[PDB]
Design a protein around this ligand. Structure first.
Ligand code: HEM
Ligand code: HEM
Lengths: 145, 145
């Protein structure tokens, strides 16, 4: 249940998400591409899903990958901005969930983004505490897949 | 090209876009839904394209319409944030262009959004000067359709 998942976002979790986002969200192009390249490096079996982006190994030099990465960061921005109202958070999550359901992405495969997020956070000096907070937000999307 | 259309956006136009967005973008749920409902009210022929959203006459109550409307405002947020770097504005514009190309939305049809944008701007007392600035930004997307 996406509603039960959203209920797991306690005051402390919401605070950790906001505090860490203030840093990671400050460079959407840089961190967005970092997230994607890490996903492809640690989970090469997911590359096939991104056929439209072309050669993803080119990273930042790939115009389609850069546009996608920046856009992805705005989806995360949308989640953070909706933390105050669970009903609005849910409708935004379900919108993006549909984008992945049509792509045949399961809850388990979507969860593969947790590794990259933990690594990007760590590179900015945000440890397991923050990684776990983000895993709970990702869990809300998983509940809708 | 799309690059040419973006590189032409002048300092004065960027200023008007940013000043008006400070206001219209401060209530994404409210103004996003207003934009969509105005589109359906003045251009009833477009309703059929949004069948995935269900009964759009339900307005704010329709969670799918609310989710779509909020997310649409973040696409505009992405455009505004990239105004000073045409290279980044272009790759983001092309990303959202593909979303509409797949739905068979023509450049002319995309331009139907100008009416609703003008009305929403007017509700906040932003005149023709601002409506003209937004039409120029919309034209950047049209260059990609
Ligand atoms: C933090 C989690 C993630 C967020 C917020 C996110 C967000 C997005 C957004 C906003 C889009 C564009 C939707 C569209 O225009 O169609 C997208 C596309 C896509 N996503 Fe994700 N995504 C995430 C994780 C994943 C993961 C882990 C996978 C794969 C295992 C995945 C697979 C896809 C695919 C295949 C596309 C289509 C790309 C294309 O052809 O343009 N996403 N995602
Ligand atoms: C300011 C201009 C507009 C922006 C920024 C915009 C943005 C978006 C975004 C972000 C999506 C979601 C993409 C996806 O998840 O696949 C979308 C979907 C769509 N847009 Fe637009 N759009 C605009 C104008 C229009 C206009 C004027 C039309 C048609 C006359 C249109 C028709 C569509 C359709 C049919 C969809 C698919 C909805 C669905 O089934 O979920 N858009 N748009």
């Amino acid at each position: 249940s996406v509603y039960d998942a959203a209920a797991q976002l306690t005051a402390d979790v919401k605070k950790d998400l906001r505090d860490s986002w203030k840093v990671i969200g400050s460079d959407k192009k840089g961190n967005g591409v970092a997230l994607m390249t890490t996903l492809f490096a640690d989970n090469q079996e997911t590359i096939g899903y991104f056929k439209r982006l072309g050669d993803v190994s080119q990273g930042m030099a790939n115009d389609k990958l850069r546009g996608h990465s920046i856009t992805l960061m705005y989806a995360l921005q949308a989640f953070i901005d909706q933390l105050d109202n669970p009903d609005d958070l849910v409708c935004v999550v379900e919108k993006f969930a549909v984008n992945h359901i049509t792509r045949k992405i399961s809850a388990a495969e979507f969860g593969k983004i947790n590794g990259p997020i933990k690594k990007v956070l760590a590179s900015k000096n945000f440890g397991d505490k923050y990684a776990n907070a983000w895993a709970k937000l990702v869990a809300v999307v998983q509940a809708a897949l």
